[model samples]
Target chain A: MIRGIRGATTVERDTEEEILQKTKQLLEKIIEENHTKPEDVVQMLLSATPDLHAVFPAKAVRELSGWQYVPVTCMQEMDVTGGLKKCIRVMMTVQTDVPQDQIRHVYLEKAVVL
Target chain B: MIRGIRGATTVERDTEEEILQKTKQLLEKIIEENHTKPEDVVQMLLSATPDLHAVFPAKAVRELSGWQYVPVTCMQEMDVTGGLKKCIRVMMTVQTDVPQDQIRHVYLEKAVVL
Candidate 1:
């Protein structure tokens, strides 16, 4: 079966270093929580709020071993009124035996409000 | 097995109606080409270029029957230099027996450049 894992985290700053570090933290926690091995991930779609232009969240995936083969892309998030600021969101598609209801979605830091 | 089907299309304008129509066209073609059923879809992640913000492209999915239960979300695409304008991209996670090597990725209209 294929499961969709959703996660989001907020960056305190718009700098490339800050965005990459926070996104890496979010991705690491997501993988750990889901027991997701990189080989099982089909693709990872990442997005960031418009204010976060310093980097593409996809860049963080490359720093993680075994994730180089995953098809990852980064996009800008739609700017809604009062939307979470400096937020990064990831929707990961993985092959797993786990049922949909068992899948976990993680929202950390200020992104919890999202 | 699970497959990731990717599709993208471009709108000539930023109007809500135009965005919806183009996105629906893109989604229908992807479903038909991949022989994907609504029940098999685990989630949908959609993004639009910064130039196009009239509406959430996820709205187009709701108008299609059987897709009502699919988890869909809208995000803004990162504004890259010289990126395709007025483009909407979708990454759909679906359960299937098909092999990833055989999966199709559809790109239509001006979005074909992506």
Candidate 2:
């Protein structure tokens, strides 16, 4: 079976460094918390709030040693009236026998309230 | 194993009815083309261009008879300078033994050019 893992984090500012660093932190945390292996990942959908176009966050995944081939696409989050800013969100699909409710979802930094 | 199925369609206008209708059509089309059961889906990420916000596309999945429990999230697509307008894109992750190359990705209506 495959399960979805949700993770998110926010940047201090909209710079290439902030976007890349926080996203990398969030992805690694999700893997560590969920006991997920890079090879088990099926695909990932990454989104940043509209204000985060300084750089494409996809670079963060390529930086990971074992995640070179992970299928990923980046988009902008819905611009709701009061949505979070400087947010980078991830929804990763991976092969796992764990039930949906049993999987751990990592929400870091400013996204902690999500 | 799990695989991702990509699908997209366009709305004639930004009206609530148009957004919901086309999105539902895309979801059903992907399921039929991929031979995917509602229960086999892990999660789906539904995205629309920045110009769409009359309604959340997740409403389309709720209208599906057996897709009640399929986890879903809605987001806005990147605001690329010349990106398509009034477009809805879907990335569905499902439990399947099929290889990535064999998956049929559906691009319909105005999205035929994608």
Candidate 3:
């Protein structure tokens, strides 16, 4: 059976560069902690809120890290009355035999340290 | 056993309404094509970029389609150079015996023809 691991980060800036920087940090951490190589990833799904038009967060990680063929896609997040603003989230589906507890879900810096 | 199906759509406007409409169509086609009932869905994850602050694409789906009971999440996508803008993507994990070849990944009109 396949396991789903989720991680998130909230950006402090509304600009394109800030979005790219923060998103790169988030994906990099996720890969490191999960022992995930871009090639090991079966597919990656990325979602952002409407406030983040600066860049597609997924590609930032891919291009910066050279994850050429990992099948990435982006979409708008759900609209809620009082949802978090400027947030980014990821659900990575990997072909792994690792236990769930061993799978660290990272939320970095000021992005919901919970 | 469960199956994972993917679908996506792109919108021109960054408004809450435009995101909702296009997301709805993309999801509706995905469900119709896969013959997926909301209750059968194990989980649905939605993602978006920073430019799309109008709404959360997943919540729009759950509320509009009355899919309240389905487990859903929203997140940000990887930041890549020159990525598609104002897009919505859905990943539906369903409890099914269906073959993946039967699955239809939907990208509606004006989103992607193929």
Candidate 4:
């Protein structure tokens, strides 16, 4: 079966290092919580708030060992009114036996407010 | 097995009607080409170029019958220099028997340049 896992985290600064660090942290937590293997992940879709122009969040995924082969894409999040800022959101599609309701979604740092 | 189907289309204008019409047309073509069922779709992630702010691309998904229950999220595409403008991109994760290499990705109108 295929299930979608969602996660979001916010970066305090709009720098390459900060974006990479926060994204890596968020991805690690999602993988750990969902018990997802590199092969199980079909694709990862990442979006950052318009204010976060430091780098592509997908670059952080490449920095992780064993994830070099995973397909990932990055885009910019809409600058909606009252929307969260400096936020990086991820949607990962994985081949999993788990049901949709059972999937855990992680929201870390300031993104917890979302 | 799980497969990812990507499709992109351009909106001539940044109005709600144009976004919805183009998105629906693009999605309909994708569904026709991929032979994907509504139940087989796990999720849809939509992104629009920064120039498109009149509406959420996901709204188009809902306007279509049989897609009301599907999970859809919308974001903004990064404003890269020389990048396509008024473009709406979609990444759909679906459960299918089709092989990864055989998945058809639709790029309509100006998005064909991608």
Q: Give interface RMSD, per candidate.
A: 2.8, 2.4, 6.3, 2.6
lDDT of 4 by residue, A8-113 (tens): 9999999999999999999999999999999999788888877877789888987678999999997667765567778999989888887665677889999898
Alpha-carbon runs more than 4 Å astray in model 2: A62-65, A68-73, A112-114, B1-39, B54-56, B59-85, B96-114
Model 2: how far is A42 from its true place, Å? 3.2
Model 2 Cα lDDT, one tens digit per residue, B2-107 = 6789999999878778888888888888888998887788998888887886777877898997876666777877778877888899989887888879999999
Q: How does residue B88 of candidate 4 score in lDDT?
A: 90
* Model 1's TM-score against the true structure: 0.64
Flag clash pairs in model 4: none
Docking class of 4: acceptable
On residues A1-114, what C-alpha lDDT tens digit does candidate 1 reach at each position? 676788899999999999989999999999998999999997888888878888788989989998889999876679755567888988888888776656777889998975
Chain A superposition TM-score, candidate 1:
0.96
Poorest stretch of ten by lDDT in candidate 4 chain B: B68-77
**lDDT tens string, model 1, B38-72?**
76888988878778767778888888877765667
Model 4 chain A TM-score equals 0.97
Q: What CAPRI grade goes to candidate 1?
A: acceptable
* DockQ, each predicted model: 0.34, 0.37, 0.15, 0.32
Evaluated on the second chain alone, the candidates' TM-scores are 0.94, 0.96, 0.88, 0.95
Mark the 10 consecutive residues where model 3 chain A has the least summed lDDT. Answer: A94-103
* Candidate 1 lDDT (Cα, 0 to 1): 0.84
Let me know the DockQ for model 4: 0.32
Scored on chain A only, each candidate's TM-score is: 0.96, 0.96, 0.88, 0.97
